[PDB]
Design a protein. Structure first.
Ligand SMILES: Cc1cc2nc3c(=O)[nH]c(=O)nc-3n(C[C@H](O)[C@H](O)[C@H](O)COP(=O)(O)OP(=O)(O)OC[C@H]3O[C@@H](n4cnc5c(N)ncnc54)[C@H](O)[C@@H]3O)c2cc1C
Ligand SMILES: Cc1cc2nc3c(=O)[nH]c(=O)nc-3n(C[C@H](O)[C@H](O)[C@H](O)COP(=O)(O)OP(=O)(O)OC[C@H]3O[C@@H](n4cnc5c(N)ncnc54)[C@H](O)[C@@H]3O)c2cc1C
Ligand SMILES: Cc1cc2nc3c(=O)[nH]c(=O)nc-3n(C[C@H](O)[C@H](O)[C@H](O)COP(=O)(O)OP(=O)(O)OC[C@H]3O[C@@H](n4cnc5c(N)ncnc54)[C@H](O)[C@@H]3O)c2cc1C
Ligand SMILES: Cc1cc2nc3c(=O)[nH]c(=O)nc-3n(C[C@H](O)[C@H](O)[C@H](O)COP(=O)(O)OP(=O)(O)OC[C@H]3O[C@@H](n4cnc5c(N)ncnc54)[C@H](O)[C@@H]3O)c2cc1C
Ligand SMILES: NC(=O)c1ccc[n+]([C@@H]2O[C@H](COP(=O)([O-])OP(=O)(O)OC[C@H]3O[C@@H](n4cnc5c(N)ncnc54)[C@H](OP(=O)(O)O)[C@@H]3O)[C@@H](O)[C@H]2O)c1
Ligand SMILES: NC(=O)c1ccc[n+]([C@@H]2O[C@H](COP(=O)([O-])OP(=O)(O)OC[C@H]3O[C@@H](n4cnc5c(N)ncnc54)[C@H](OP(=O)(O)O)[C@@H]3O)[C@@H](O)[C@H]2O)c1
Lengths: 323, 323, 322, 323
């Protein structure tokens, strides 16, 4: 088999940042990525614009420079590839880590391709692989998506969006521009404070001109092949519907996390993996986490801007264990 | 059942142009589309730029205006949606025509959703849905694609492209820019004259700088999961390979075309469906074809520029039969 | 000379709009344009993005379509040309109108290139060409601009913006992106309500991060070649400064409008030419106005979305006079 | 009055690169730029796309990364600003060097604002500031430009282009798309070999479809207020004309170069300042040149790709002369 000093599961922005900082402290590292690098960003909608400025998304001391104020999807894809190029990062792409076991101060990593042995382990798997479950009658129909890519095919179609945060509002804007009849169904009372303040004005003007239907205090009770039923303050309504976008968020792969021996503790910000807030080391010795995997479900506490700093913290703790 | 005067199978540019012109002659028409309108363009590579100027792609008195010299994908998607909006065209989306049978002087169309009765039938299904068969050992592996979408996931991967016309060179440029190691194997002797003269210089420069491996007179003999074997002037060569893009063209759904009763004619123009060159009517009475489906093999005779004129021709012939 | 039935002064969106609807009613027209068509849009900042949708700017039987939600400066340029191409409009470019005198029931039009005599006249000259005067010492210095174009050359320069409307806010964001040290000096108390609610948060965040200096209740008192002096509730402050953008708004060429015999107003909500509202005809018979030149009395503003609809109202009034 | 070790006249790509490389060897440098940094690039047409790839334009180890194949004008502006930011370069902008004289072991530099004294001088002023002389009757009229910016104001105007290289061909394409009536007058016999091979097809197709007038072997003899008279192999023609674009090239400020005491040596392939090819030092001790100002004799073309390496070579020569 292969023996490397450190292995990092996940080649996202926070995973890449973890390998760069470990390499800067003289630790030979290998990233194993289920797809290719920044697969999460690659899976954004094709039109997506980041909400951060491009400099705040930069890692490794490679400047992220874009004429525009905020960068789009593909611009980040080009950047992070150059980040891997510049730091000469070892990246085993299209390989899925399936099992991690610790044996006498060593890890045994079993993937889809090879078997690995390492001293240090860093899990930066994010949460985008596991979408929250809808739990309404009809939620498993093929007309229900939890991911948004493009809006053109839904031209002149009756579309319902479940959710109220940035994914829902973003998709509604793109779906309206493509000729779809968009009905957003949010359970809250007012707009979520997490919708960024420069996007909501363009959405509110559309609901004022009666181009997009917005409904508050709305919970979806039934989804059929061609209808959607939702209740507002008790009153049930049923409308024709062709597709449903369940933008209800994501959550980490807790099944994988417990199978290595990591505990879920639940605390201030919620159900999160147990880790030392000063070193990001988990309850399992020599196993660290990095990225949005440390926040839990809450998709507003940790993002790319602050998750990229975990690598520098992990690098210090690993170099310390070298007595 | 539903009874409409005319039905058009396919909502591509030539299908839309056919429906516009029939409506101009007072013919009630219905488009049945397997996906949504201009699904072909929607399935282009994401970065794709058209070879034609935007005026040449315009149909049914709706001007196609783009600040750019040549229009990109999405821009055509936005345009053709506005064409459907402007001309009030009936488009039953996500419905696939499965069976056509002639009874008396009327057609019985059976789809995935409904059954229809019409007098005139127009088949404009194109050829993009059916890729040419490779016919080499290993062609059925999941690592072999006949369609190109994006190049980022193949970053730092060993990629081989089979083909030599515009699809191959476009994919090679995008794959080279995304950091892949590209090797183009062409069975021809020199560059195909059908490569647009403003794209090829960008390709040959990278070949001269040895950034893209180009092989002429090369035929692929075997594809494994991680090698590709090809012969050059008799010499067999084997290189490591991660993915294969078989850009070997497409062909019409001849099975569906024979299942309605339309003849395939072995002509010295590239084997094409049987139709009257002056009206585009097939051997079946009141059944027409439109678009690139009339060129059969050669994907270089008919494109959007001249295929959009089929609609005007069919409308005259149908108006001659009156009603 | 030349004699045309109707002549229109100005080739902006509303000048083009009035020509189309008069032609639809069978009125032969000629557009006399100081520059070329939509000179105003051409003289936007190079980066500029409209705040309207792409179809609220569309005129006369030509759809305006863009893959983006809001079109940019260059896309409108390409569009409004194609509108002229589609409608076969007669436009005389680089020809400024200098004198209009009403003799008989006709007009004699004196331009920089020929003499014209016409029955119907439309003055659609807008306001973007005549900038409000600054009224501070040093306003005539070469370091003082009333137009923003690009931000690059002011990289690592000390810049000051006078005003607080969308013009001042847009130019500040662009100059910050280009690395300039920007100080916005506004005479008002809070943020102008006319700032687009999707633009303000970007300017707000930069100010709080101390990337852009924002001083409310600020009045500029002096401009030297290397400083700018401004008072904030009486307290004077003087800072090093390399360039100045007086984004203090604009006003129509009223001097020209009176010189033909059209009265002004200055009533409560502003100041406007006299027009019938129902025909847009002025006190001068057979003399019409169109565009943002008509704003001033109404409590609402005039953009391209509304002002473009004036050409239709004018066409009926001219068709009524036959 | 002000004393710095080294001064660089010109803040273009090659000037900026020279200051970075000198700073890498511990030399205190000051750039004096008539406008701001890369003013030459700033004065391109607003649409201009580079013919080099973005990697080849990179300097002072700051990567120039752009999603697209080739970088456009503004994108280079954004990049080079970040280069000055990243290296912290002293850039006295809007200052024009008027006089340079050698005294003792010092130079006395007189600008528009201050006076400077330095040991090492590097002149990297380029050529884009001083246009070649037209030498036909009417060349000083306001309707005659030697610089192209945008094409919209010339919509539906009669425009004549003098020249035959990329500047002329680029301007012809941009002016045609804006509705101008373009006549190109080239004193050559065939298309210039310096036109890029991926642009000539686009220009070729417009000439063959009679949308642009192309006239070889044409020399302009007179420019009037609204006509232009030109002879082709002696035969004179006169056409109506509203504006004239004299794309007849540019040349360095040789007068400024001779006024400091550097010899300009005429030869074949053009005329260049005299300098040692291994240090780029002129006949004046401690006076160097950098950038495209160095081309002329050596029979080689200079662009940003190769001009950016002068700084590293000059830095060695300045370091060899010690302190
Ligand atoms: C539309 C959209 C826009 C956004 N915009 C912004 C923005 O502007 N700014 C910002 O800061 N954040 C933004 N985000 C959030 C951003 O995507 C996350 O903060 C970020 O992706 C988290 O990075 P990560 O490295 O922690 O994990 P991820 O980015 O999710 O990547 C983890 C990687 O691990 C891989 N992986 C998963 N399971 C396995 C396994 N078993 N074996 C091997 N590999 C595995 C995945 O394929 C993936 O490549 C946006 C998100 C979305 C959806
Ligand atoms: C990358 C790329 C770039 C191209 N660039 C250009 C260019 O610049 N200029 C140009 O002129 N051409 C270009 N083409 C070619 C262009 O795609 C075709 O010429 C054009 O799409 C033909 O239109 P059509 O209406 O005849 O058929 P299509 O556009 O192929 O559409 C036929 C439609 O019928 C539908 N359909 C198929 N079977 C059924 C069924 N059984 N029931 C119902 N619906 C069905 C399909 O889903 C499809 O939507 C390009 C092609 C590619 C792949
Ligand atoms: C940065 C910026 C952004 C804007 N964004 C928007 C937006 O998103 N939406 C919107 O609706 N509006 C917008 N506007 C305002 C818009 O420019 C005006 O509403 C519009 O120009 C009015 O059109 P008009 O035809 O009435 O006048 P103009 O567009 O100004 O055109 C009048 C024409 O007359 C010519 N002319 C002037 N004087 C004379 C003379 N004496 N003789 C001959 N010709 C003359 C001028 O050169 C000009 O070509 C914006 C303005 C600015 C500065
Ligand atoms: C339309 C166009 C497209 C081009 N595309 C490309 C391309 O794709 N790739 C490529 O490699 N090249 C390209 N070029 C060429 C490129 O512009 C030059 O090769 C490059 O700018 C040379 O840089 P430089 O530093 O040598 O001098 P420059 O950058 O040209 O000029 C040096 C600076 O000195 C300043 N200066 C002048 N006189 C004084 C003075 N007295 N005091 C102080 N400062 C002064 C000037 O303002 C200028 O900014 C293109 C040129 C044009 C016109
Ligand atoms: N602008 C952008 O660039 C952009 C766009 C999309 C996403 N993102 C990023 O994407 C990440 C998260 O992706 P996301 O937006 O899909 O997730 P998210 O931010 O967690 O959104 C969750 C949404 O789903 C609702 N929801 C949660 N559980 C639900 C349940 N069981 N039933 C019904 N509704 C439920 C939430 O309700 P509550 O509001 O009551 O919690 C909220 O509306 C964040 O980091 C976010 O910033 C950014
Ligand atoms: N620039 C763009 O926007 C763009 C990009 C892609 C496609 N297109 C258009 O799409 C259409 C189809 O183009 P295409 O290139 O996909 O198809 P195509 O025109 O049929 O070209 C097929 C290519 O594959 C080769 N080939 C065919 N069968 C093969 C086999 N069995 N084994 C090996 N090689 C084989 C062909 O060889 P031969 O040369 O000997 O025939 C040719 O090089 C055309 O209209 C094209 O212009 C446009």
């Amino acid at each position: 088999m292969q023996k490397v000093e450190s292995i990092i599961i996940g080649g996202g922005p926070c995973g890449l940042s973890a390998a760069i900082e470990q390499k800067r402290k003289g630790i030979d590292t290998l990233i194993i990525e289920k797809g290719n690098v920044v697969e999460s960003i690659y899976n954004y909608p094709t039109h997506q614009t980041f909400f951060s400025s491009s400099d705040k998304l930069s890692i490794g001391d490679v400047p992220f420079i874009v004429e525009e104020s905020k960068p789009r999807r593909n611009q980040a894809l080009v950047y992070y590839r150059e980040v891997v190029k510049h730091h000469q990062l070892k990246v085993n792409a299209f390989e899925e880590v399936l099992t991690v076991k610790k044996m006498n101060n060593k890890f045994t990593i079993t993937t889809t391709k090879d078997v690995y042995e390492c001293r240090f382990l860093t899990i930066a798997t994010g949460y985008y692989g596991q979408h929250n479950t809808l739990e309404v009658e009809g939620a498993d129909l093929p007309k229900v998506f939890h991911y948004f890519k493009e809006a053109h095919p839904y031209f002149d179609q009756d579309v319902v969006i479940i959710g109220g945060k940035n994914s829902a509002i973003d998709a509604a804007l793109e779906l309206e521009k493509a000729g779809a009849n968009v009905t957003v169904l949010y359970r809250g009372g007012d707009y979520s404070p997490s919708i960024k303040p420069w996007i909501l004005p363009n959405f509110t003007a559309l609901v004022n001109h009666e181009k997009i239907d917005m409904e508050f205090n709305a919970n979806v009770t039934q989804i059929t092949e061609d209808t959607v039923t939702y209740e507002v303050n008790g009153e049930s309504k049923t409308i024709h519907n062709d597709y449903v976008f369940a933008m209800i968020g994501y959550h980490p792969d807790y099944e994988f996390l417990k199978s290595v021996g990591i505990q879920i503790n639940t605390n201030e910000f919620g159900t999160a993996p147990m880790y030392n807030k000063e070193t990001y080391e988990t309850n399992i010795e020599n196993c660290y986490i990095a990225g949005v995997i440390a926040a839990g479900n809450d998709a507003n506490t940790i993002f790319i801007e602050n998750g990229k700093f975990h690598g520098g913290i992990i690098a210090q703790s690993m170099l310390a264990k070298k007595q």
